[PDB]
Scaffold this active site. Structure first.
Site, PDB file in Angstrom:
ATOM      1  N   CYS A  79       0.855  -1.187   0.000  1.00  0.00           N
ATOM      2  CA  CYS A  79       0.000   0.000   0.000  1.00  0.00           C
ATOM      3  C   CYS A  79       0.895   1.242   0.000  1.00  0.00           C
ATOM      4  O   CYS A  79       1.541   1.536  -1.005  1.00  0.00           O
ATOM      5  CB  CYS A  79      -0.918  -0.029   1.233  1.00  0.00           C
ATOM      6  SG  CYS A  79      -2.077   1.374   1.417  1.00  0.00           S
ATOM      7  N   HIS A 170      -2.997  -5.672   1.328  1.00  0.00           N
ATOM      8  CA  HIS A 170      -2.389  -5.882   2.639  1.00  0.00           C
ATOM      9  C   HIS A 170      -2.273  -7.337   3.085  1.00  0.00           C
ATOM     10  O   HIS A 170      -3.183  -7.872   3.723  1.00  0.00           O
ATOM     11  CB  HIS A 170      -3.197  -5.126   3.696  1.00  0.00           C
ATOM     12  CG  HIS A 170      -3.245  -3.646   3.486  1.00  0.00           C
ATOM     13  ND1 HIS A 170      -2.323  -2.786   4.041  1.00  0.00           N
ATOM     14  CD2 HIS A 170      -4.111  -2.873   2.790  1.00  0.00           C
ATOM     15  CE1 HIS A 170      -2.621  -1.544   3.699  1.00  0.00           C
ATOM     16  NE2 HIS A 170      -3.702  -1.569   2.940  1.00  0.00           N
ATOM     17  N   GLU A 172      -0.547  -8.436   5.380  1.00  0.00           N
ATOM     18  CA  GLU A 172      -0.455  -8.417   6.838  1.00  0.00           C
ATOM     19  C   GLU A 172      -1.830  -8.318   7.493  1.00  0.00           C
ATOM     20  O   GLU A 172      -1.948  -8.418   8.717  1.00  0.00           O
ATOM     21  CB  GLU A 172       0.426  -7.253   7.317  1.00  0.00           C
ATOM     22  CG  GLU A 172      -0.253  -5.882   7.295  1.00  0.00           C
ATOM     23  CD  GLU A 172      -0.340  -5.258   5.914  1.00  0.00           C
ATOM     24  OE1 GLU A 172      -0.041  -5.945   4.911  1.00  0.00           O
ATOM     25  OE2 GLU A 172      -0.714  -4.065   5.834  1.00  0.00           O
TER      26      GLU A 172
END
Length: 189
Positions: A79, A170, A172
């Site tokens: 991002c 993302h 994560e």
């Protein structure tokens, strides 16, 4: 520790947590000195103009550029991190950034009413991976030396250039650490 996450601003916490699943205790990078000893650095999601401004001000940008150029540091930008890596940011030519990745990126440009969505993605070599998109940037153009590892439809969302990896989503924000491991493997960790 040979793995760090840039912690000047943003969501570095989520990457540190994701890295724990790989048995890694991530080093929070807030000063240029923190880059010493690292084999890999993750630039997290967050506010790209701020991460860029602070990284430049603290001399981190320049040292990272030097480290990548000499091939002693792998980078993974997600991002905001992907935006930071881009050589060109559409509409913001002067935005502080590293700019090592041969790509044209446009910030939050997906054009959807709700600025958040999720898609199952096919990642080359890795397999199916759940992609979490939030105000996601768009990879408008890619240089010849850039490899596309995953697409949403035909749109590139995960790209690689040597030891530089970038995603508009993302990883994560999922509990799947396979994309992080893929990164550590290419970084030689």
């Amino acid at each position: 520790g040979v793995v760090g996450v840039l912690a000047l601003q943003g969501d570095f916490r989520e990457h540190k947590e994701a890295l724990k699943r790989l048995g890694i205790e991530a080093k929070e990078v807030r000063k240029k000195e923190h880059l010493e000893g690292l084999k890999a650095l993750i630039v997290p999601g967050g506010e790209s103009t701020t991460i860029g401004k602070l990284a430049r001000e603290y001399g981190i940008e320049d040292e990272v550029r030097k480290r990548v150029e000499e091939g002693s540091l792998a980078l993974f930008g997600t991002c905001a991190g992907a935006i930071w890596l881009a050589k060109e940011i559409v509409g913001y030519p002067e935005q502080p950034r590293l700019g090592v990745l041969e790509a044209w990126v446009e910030r939050n440009a997906f054009g959807r009413q709700v600025e958040s969505f999720e898609e199952d993605l096919e990642v080359e070599g890795l397999g199916s991976f759940h992609g979490v998109f939030i105000r996601a940037p768009v990879f408008r153009r890619l240089g010849e030396g850039v490899e596309v590892l995953a697409r949403l439809g035909d749109l590139p969302v995960l790209v690689r250039q040597g030891k530089v990896l970038a995603s508009s989503f993302h990883p994560e924000l999922t509990e799947d650490p396979r994309l992080h491991r893929y990164f550590l493997e290419l970084a030689g960790v």
